[PDB]
Amino acid sequence: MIIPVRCFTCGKIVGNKWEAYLGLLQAEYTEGDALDALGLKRYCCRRMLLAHVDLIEKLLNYAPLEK
Amino acid sequence: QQPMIYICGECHTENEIKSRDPIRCRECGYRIMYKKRTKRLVVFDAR
Amino acid sequence: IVQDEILAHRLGLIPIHADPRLFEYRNQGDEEGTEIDTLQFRLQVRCTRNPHAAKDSSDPNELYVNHKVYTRHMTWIPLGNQADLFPEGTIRPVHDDILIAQLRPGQEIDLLMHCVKGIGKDHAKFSPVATASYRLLPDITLLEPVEGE
Amino acid sequence: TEFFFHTMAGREGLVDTAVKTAETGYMQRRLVKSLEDLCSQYDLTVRSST
Amino acid sequence: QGRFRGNLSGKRVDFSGRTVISPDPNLRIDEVAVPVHVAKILTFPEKVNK
Amino acid sequence: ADFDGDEMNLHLPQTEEAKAEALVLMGTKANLVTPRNGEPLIAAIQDFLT
Amino acid sequence: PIPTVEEKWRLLPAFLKVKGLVKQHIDSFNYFINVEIKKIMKANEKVTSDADPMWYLKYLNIYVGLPDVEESFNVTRPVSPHECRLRDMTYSAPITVDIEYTRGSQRIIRNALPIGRMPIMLRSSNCVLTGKTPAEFAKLNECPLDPGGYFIVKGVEKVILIQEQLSKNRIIVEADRKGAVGASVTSSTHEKKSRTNMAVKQGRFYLRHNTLSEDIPIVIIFKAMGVESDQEIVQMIGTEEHVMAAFGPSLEECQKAQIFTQMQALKYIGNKVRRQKTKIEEARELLASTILTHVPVKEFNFRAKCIYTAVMVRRVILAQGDNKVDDRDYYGNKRLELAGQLLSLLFEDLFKKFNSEMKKIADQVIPKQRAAQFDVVKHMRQDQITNGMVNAISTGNWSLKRFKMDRQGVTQVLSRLSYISALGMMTRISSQFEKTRKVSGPRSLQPSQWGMLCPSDTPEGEACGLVKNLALMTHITTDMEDGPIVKLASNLGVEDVNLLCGEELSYPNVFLVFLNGNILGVIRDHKKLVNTFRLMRRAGYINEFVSISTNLTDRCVYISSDGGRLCRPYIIVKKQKPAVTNKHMEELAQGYRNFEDFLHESLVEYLDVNEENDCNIALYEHTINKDTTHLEIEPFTLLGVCAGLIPYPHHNQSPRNTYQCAMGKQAMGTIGYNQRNRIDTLMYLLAYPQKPMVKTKTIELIEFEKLPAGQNATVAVMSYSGYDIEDALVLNKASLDRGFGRCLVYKNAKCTLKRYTNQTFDKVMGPMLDAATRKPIWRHEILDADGICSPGEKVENKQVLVNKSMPTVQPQYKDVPITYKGATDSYIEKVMISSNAEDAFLIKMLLRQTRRPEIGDKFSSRHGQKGVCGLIVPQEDMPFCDSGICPDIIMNPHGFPSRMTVGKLIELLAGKAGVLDGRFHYGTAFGGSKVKDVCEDLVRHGYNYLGKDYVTSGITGEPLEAYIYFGPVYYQKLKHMVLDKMHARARGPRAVLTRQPTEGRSRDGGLRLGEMERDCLIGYGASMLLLERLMISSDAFEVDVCGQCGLLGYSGWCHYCKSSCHVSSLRIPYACKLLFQELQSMNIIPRLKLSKYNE
Amino acid sequence: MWYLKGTVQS
Amino acid sequence: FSIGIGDVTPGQGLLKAKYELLNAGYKKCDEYIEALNTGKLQQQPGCTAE
RNA sequence: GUGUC
Ligand SMILES: [Zn+2]
Ligand SMILES: [Zn+2]
Ligand SMILES: [Zn+2]
């Protein structure tokens, strides 16, 4: 649902670059370009941001809102 | 004592049911209501 | 929308910039919490609408106020009189912009967490190092003189 | 075409392992009910209940 | 689901259980590990000697 | 067993007279050959053989 | 080299946008409430009473409205599906009809007359969930990815399974225990199901139908039909040397019995016929419209029928003496049945019942009247229709004796475990045969089915082929009429069968025309007929869903236009080449030239199973030959919905493919976009679902990348200490603590409470306070001051959730406190309070439980490899290779060769290369990516090229001699945790009938000891334990009987002898004493004879 | 006919 | 002990070894068709042509 | 009735 704060295998904090990765995918950058520019070099802590779905965004449209 | 506060699912208005009343909303015509969260202190584990 | 257990787990995954040498080790069991072996942290944020934002907006960054919760919202409250020990701000999260939860108009979150000392053998959140590895030195030995191509 | 001919034989064994259990258990419970009291005596002789 | 081989033959037993098995190559040939949660439920009656 | 979805069951003898009968007849050390032919059924599995 | 168009992969999405997967379930219903609902109204159109021919009612027009609900008093407001799903209501809309009835002397035409309601589908034409936008779909609290197609009755989702049946109006010739026999089943629209069969014995043909007493000779039936002279009889049968040697005996035994006239044959038949008006008219009307009603008779002419019987006899003769037999395994004959015609039959039967019984409601009032005019709308009822519809949908008992049919298990609750289990159930098909061991043909994969039913998609267990799933590209044809077809066939030059005699049909050049099991006539040079019909179909005048085929062994052309046939589009080619070119698909990519005009431009066409029998189809465009007629669009559409999630299916074996397609629906994950609002009985959710790196085009077609049910994890294929035995897998403790594989369970607890016919009621007192301090009691701790539990609390074992106090019958009240039973400690999510349609308060509670993976949980590899977890290993172990990457899940290399799974290594390699490069790799079936361009790309980075890496063991600190296979793999967590599959009991409740442990864990029962386990104790020879755990621990009872007369006494006293002198006791199981007391009432007294154990 | 909002004291 | 995809890889000298076999097999099998059509294939067992 | 062995 939400990007994990830490990696599953090693334990590197990968939850502080999700919004930066999103903002860098709109500057005409390739997925690999964003991934090797953010700071990820190995592949165990790289598929946390690459292969990740965002369902809380779709879950907030059904969330209770005040009138 | 304090009237039981209930929230709706269409307008989310906090109203009260007095006693043996038609379960509805006074703003809209929705017939389903929800409940508020408890005001107690529950402990959780961060392990 | 996030679970309480998932929120507590993600908060426990947050590391803390603090010196564990000054603090003691907790005795066999006590949950009340003394002054020498427990660090208090408070977090409180509720989502409200922006009255000035615009006529017609879809982008939630300016439409709603404080929609994304980071680790910078967590505030450290002193317990006892150990405030003069660490001068101003040596006790704060290492990373400040880490997504914790998302809020909408009509939502509120208020929590108070306790930080204690532990070893990495108990849980993964007590690991003080992210990567600890080593490598053997390589060696490449040629045998015969090579040609150009 | 090769994948279809390969999966044709896979269904040959999957329908065979589903049916064996029935008549096998039937023949087992029919064979036990006839031979369940045959015992050896102390004079090296096998006899029935009679 | 009768009374001859359904009840008389069946006679469902007590003081039993069933659970998924897992490997553990640290025991002997005649050993088996039982969870403590099940061991707390099961009891064995015995008479007290001297 | 196949060790992927198997759920086996367990029973506990209640009387002392039966606790000694299941140890001499239904013993893991005693029952190592099968009455069908006479071959040992408990030798090793793939990993230990390799 | 041949010109190849690499563009035809975009035809399939545009085709599924029109119809396909689940849109046909809605097409069958949208066509039924627009075409057949008025056909039934026109069928039952005029009904009048017989008291006096002056009263009658007429049916002008009938229609249904939009989904509406009738509240307290004239309150009709538009209701949403979610409201009906939460209020335990039913999604239905009323049916308003405009009929007219004559009261007194004048006629009354009352418009908009309501007669009942009818359920409406979720994505139908009358529903509100159609033509909306995702922003508006979020307004009604409904998932936009929900395919729909189910029925909501009493707050549950019910889907009707497709059921396959055999073809009607056709002749079958099959062999039985002695010889060969022909049969014919007849069933038209009107309810008349007949089954006639002609059998051969002693070289004599006999006709069997259940209306006749015994056999009637075929020559007698011929002479009774109207053909008198025996010469034209053989002429119609066949003029051949070998067909006469087999038809002579019957002719001579016919000449034996004195029957030479039509009256003689009719009297003979009428004497043979039994039925519970003379014999001649009985036999005449019995041969008219009883035996074969699918062949209509205009005035009284039995000629079409006798030529039909003659060609049947000829087919049986040609079958006789040979090994040419018809089988029921052919799918070109098998038809499918959706929910449309079932609802049609139900509705027409309910309508006929409502018209026929209300005809009797006003039939007992006309003579026994009080005034001059009779009102019928006050003699009207609107509960039987709704009751019948809801009962048939929810109960599942399709019982129509007006239609002579009883069917069970047709509707089933929709599986909401995952997103694949919901869609995969909509394409599930049920067979007509029952689940028995005798079947081996129908269960076996038939060569007939090609691209219509997924071969791999089938449950493994008892039913191993009785349940099948549809393919990606296929269409179900609806029913049509045959007017213009017959008109064009008559204009083409087909001959009338009533002019030419029986001799010309034996001619080899003569071909017979069959249309839905009906002989149209004789045609010569059938090739021109087939060509012209195909050209007219490609033109556009005739509808595209009309099949035409030709069979040369019997020399007959079949024209099939019945509904319920399988259709899939095929690309047409002309003499060497596909008509579809690059310029035709560039416009499709642009945004014009869609599928319908492609069909209108004669570029693609539908073919059925029987029509592709006489056609040549090319797999690819390099295999196109000079006789190929059609070209299959894509070869990867053969796989089904559950089989489209397996990377490289051709690399894997069919048992593994079956296991994986079966386990894909049990894998837990996210359900949809609104999972917090919906309150289902049991819900399994994941915490952080990942995205599959090696995805399939079928995944993109269904948009599975929005709702994945698994996670990517680093796998190391190598043996570990001791815990990767046959299927055990090793986990990483650090990864499990970090949160790899976190699951959540959601349980529902609902309680309704109502009033009674008296003024008695129910009430909820609430919490209980003590006298020492003002605290809620331990029993009612979570309860609020209202009387229910508040959300955001933690409920432990055996604690009260809601207090329910109801009267025994001022009045005394018995409290029924709902108590939560569970080994775990649950949490409260939310509480819903509402009212149902019958004015009762409903309180629903959702209980959340977060669980973590432990030793005893079942995981899969999405490649047909399931296993329970073994040893949980910390992070000091699990060696890194160079960079510091630890194995997340240790895989055993010993289960690979026997299972024979090569797609796993290819998927691992592709995933590693993708996560290194940064792009998803395609792994579709019969294509995707190779292992030649990917391995050379793995060199640019700096890793080894295929799979190997240098590892450094952690427990010792020494390097590994051999290299280990590392890489990311998409794993998934399944159900059946060890937390629920764990039970134990020592002394609990017993049954009242017999003192024995009850069944099931929900009632805390025990285990059963059957006969096969008793045989193991008998083979050993132990008698003490066999008696201890069958009599001592199960049921030990002490009974008493007498020595004088063996009988069951009581209190050491007999009622037969009335003396306690001869009285003794014994130990017997309660079951045996119960059996004795039961047999004594059957005039079977077990007189017992006691003795001393010393004796 | 209903009755809610009660507390029983012991 | 580990297995990878490099373990199961066809050798370059192996692809042309089975190519010869497949070609000879096809050339030999596609002759019996016209051999049967012409009328040949003397039969040792009592059987039919196909 | 469904699911696993
Ligand atoms: Zn990492
Ligand atoms: Zn409201
Ligand atoms: Zn007596």
Beta strand G617-618 pairing with G630-631:
parallel
Q: Does E27 touch chain G (CB under 8 A)?
A: no
Contacts of G898 (CB under 8 A, 6+ apart): none
How many angstroms does the Cα of residue G1082 sit away from the middle of ligand 3?
20
Determine the structural domain holding residue C20 and report its residue range: 1-129
Protein-to-nucleotide distance from the CA of G871 to the C1' of J3, whole angstroms: 27
d(CA G1017, CA G424): 46
Protein-to-nucleotide distance from the CA of D29 to the C1' of J4, whole angstroms: 25
- The DSSP 8-state label assigned to residue G242 in this structure reads H
How is the beta sheet containing G216-217 ordered, strand by strand?
G170-175, G180-186, G194-201, G204-208, G216-217
How many angstroms does the Cα of residue B23 sit away from the middle of ligand 2?
11
CB-CB under 8 Å, A59 with G883: no
Please tell me whether E3 is known to bind a ligand: no
How many contacts, defined by CB atoms under 8 Å, are there between C and G?
Answer: 35
CATH of the domain at C6: 2.170.120.12
CB G934 within 8 A of CB G910: yes
Q: Does D35 touch chain G (CB under 8 A)?
A: no
> Residue for token digits 């053969």?
G638
Chains that touch G (3 or more CB pairs under 8 A): A, B, C, D, E, F, H, I
Task: Tabulate helix, strand, coil % of chain D (nearest 5).
Answer: 60, 10, 30
Q: Does H10 touch chain B (CB under 8 A)?
A: no
Cα radius of gyration rounded to whole Å, chain F: 15
∠ CA(C15), CA(C21), CA(C23), 5° rounding?
80
Contacts of G358 (CB under 8 A, 6+ apart): G379, G380, G381
Nearest CA in chain G to D10: G654
* Lookup: tokens for G192: 């008349």
Q: How many angstroms separate the CA of residue G445 from the nearest CA in chain D?
A: 6
d(CA C148, CA C145): 10
Three-state SS sequence of G589-624: HHCCCCHHHHHHCCCEEEECCCCHHHCCEECCCCCC
d(CA G698, CA G637): 9
Say how many domains are in chain B: 1
Nearest CA in chain C to B45: C8
Residues lining strand J at under 7 Å (Cβ) are: F 1-2, 4-6; G 409, 412, 435, 459-461, 463, 662-663, 666, 866, 976
Q: Which residues pair with G180 in a beta bridge?
A: G175
- Residue C142 belongs to some domain of the structure: no
How many angstroms does the Cα of residue C84 sit away from the middle of ligand 3?
99
Closest CA to G28 of G563, G599, G605: G563
Say how many domains are in chain C: 1
Beta strand G162-165 pairing with G157-160:
unpaired
Three-state SS sequence of G687-711: CCCECCCEECHHHHHHCCCCCCCCE
* Lookup: tokens for G1004: 């805390």
The CA distances from residue G4 to G135, G571, G618, G629, in Å, are 42, 14, 13, 17
Determine the structural domain holding residue B29 and report its residue range: 1-47
- Residue C80 belongs to some domain of the structure: yes
For residue D47, which amino acid is it?
A: R
DSSP-assigned letters across all residues of B14-39? -EE--SS-----SSS---EEEEPPP-
Counting ligands in written order, which one lies closest to the CA of residue G886? Answer: 1
CB G950 within 8 A of CB G822: no
Beta strand G889-891 pairing with G711-717:
parallel
Q: How many angstroms separate the CA of residue F45 from the nearest CA in chain G?
A: 9
Neighbours of G677 (CB within 10 A): 19
Neighbours of B47 (CB within 10 A): 12
Neighbours of A13 (CB within 10 A): 18
Any contact of E with B, at least 3 CB pairs below 8 A? Answer: no
DSSP-assigned letters across all residues of G953-1017? -SSS--B-SS-EEEEEEEEEE-S--TTTSEEEESS--B-SSSSSBPSSTTTT--B---HHHHHHH
* Lookup: tokens for B13: 């208005």
CB-CB under 8 Å, G714 with A51: no
How many angstroms does the Cα of residue A14 sit away from the middle of ligand 1?
8
Protein-to-nucleotide distance from the CA of G661 to the C1' of J1, whole angstroms: 21
- Residue C139 belongs to some domain of the structure: no
Counting ligands in written order, which one lies closest to the CA of residue G1050? Answer: 3
Q: How many angstroms separate the CA of residue D32 from the nearest CA in chain G?
A: 8
- Residue C95 belongs to some domain of the structure: yes
DSSP-assigned letters across all residues of G93-114? EEEEEEEEEEETTEEEEEEEEE
- Residue C49 belongs to some domain of the structure: yes
For residue C106, which amino acid is it?
A: G
What is the stated resolution of the deposited model, in angstroms?
Answer: 2.9
Please tell me whether G195 is known to bind a ligand: yes
By C-alpha to C1' distance, J4 is nearest to F5
CB-CB under 8 Å, C10 with A65: no
Q: Give SS3 for G44.
A: coil
- The DSSP 8-state label assigned to residue B43 in this structure reads -
Protein-to-nucleotide distance from the CA of F6 to the C1' of J5, whole angstroms: 5
- Best interface-test mutation with H: which of B2, B5, B19, B33 has the largest number of H CBs within 10 A? B19
Which candidate from G87, G785, G791 shows the least CB-CB separation from B32?
Answer: G87
CB G964 within 8 A of CB G716: yes
Q: Which residues surround ligand 1, an ion (CB under 5 A)?
A: A 7, 10, 12, 44-45
Nearest CA in chain B to A66: B12
Nearest CA in chain C to A61: C104
Task: Tabulate helix, strand, coil % of chain G (nearest 5).
Answer: 25, 25, 50
Task: Given the residues G479, G614, G727, G949, select the one marked as catalytic.
Answer: G727
d(CA G711, CA G650): 24
By C-alpha to C1' distance, J5 is nearest to F6
Protein-to-nucleotide distance from the CA of G441 to the C1' of J2, whole angstroms: 25
Which candidate from C1, C9, C132 shows the least CB-CB separation from G739?
Answer: C9
G326 is catalytic: no
CB G544 within 8 A of CB G606: yes
d(CA G1076, CA G416): 50
Protein-to-nucleotide distance from the CA of G272 to the C1' of J4, whole angstroms: 58
d(CA G749, CA G847): 8
- H/E element holding G180? strand G180-186
How many angstroms does the Cα of residue G734 sit away from the middle of ligand 1?
12
The CA distances from residue C112 to A23, C40, C77, G590, in Å, are 32, 7, 10, 58
d(CA G645, CA G903): 12
Furthest CA-CA distance within chain H: 26
- Residue C134 belongs to some domain of the structure: no
Q: Does C120 touch chain A (CB under 8 A)?
A: no
Nearest CA in chain A to C98: A16
CB-CB under 8 Å, G848 with C127: no
Contacts of G381 (CB under 8 A, 6+ apart): G358
Q: Does B28 touch chain A (CB under 8 A)?
A: no
Contacts of G832 (CB under 8 A, 6+ apart): B32, B33, B34, G86, G679, G842, G843, G844, G845
- Residue C145 belongs to some domain of the structure: no
d(CA G899, CA B36): 54
Q: Does G135 touch chain F (CB under 8 A)?
A: no
Any contact of G with A, at least 3 CB pairs below 8 A? Answer: yes
* Lookup: tokens for G697: 């085009």
Q: Give SS3 for G19.
A: coil
Please tell me whether F47 is known to bind a ligand: no
Q: Does C107 touch chain A (CB under 8 A)?
A: yes
The CA distances from residue G763 to B24, C72, G820, in Å, are 19, 50, 20
Q: Does G1028 touch chain F (CB under 8 A)?
A: yes
Closest CA to G310 of G245, G238, G206, G248: G238
Burial (CB count within 10 angstroms: exposed 0-12, middle 13-18, buried 19+), residue A33: middle
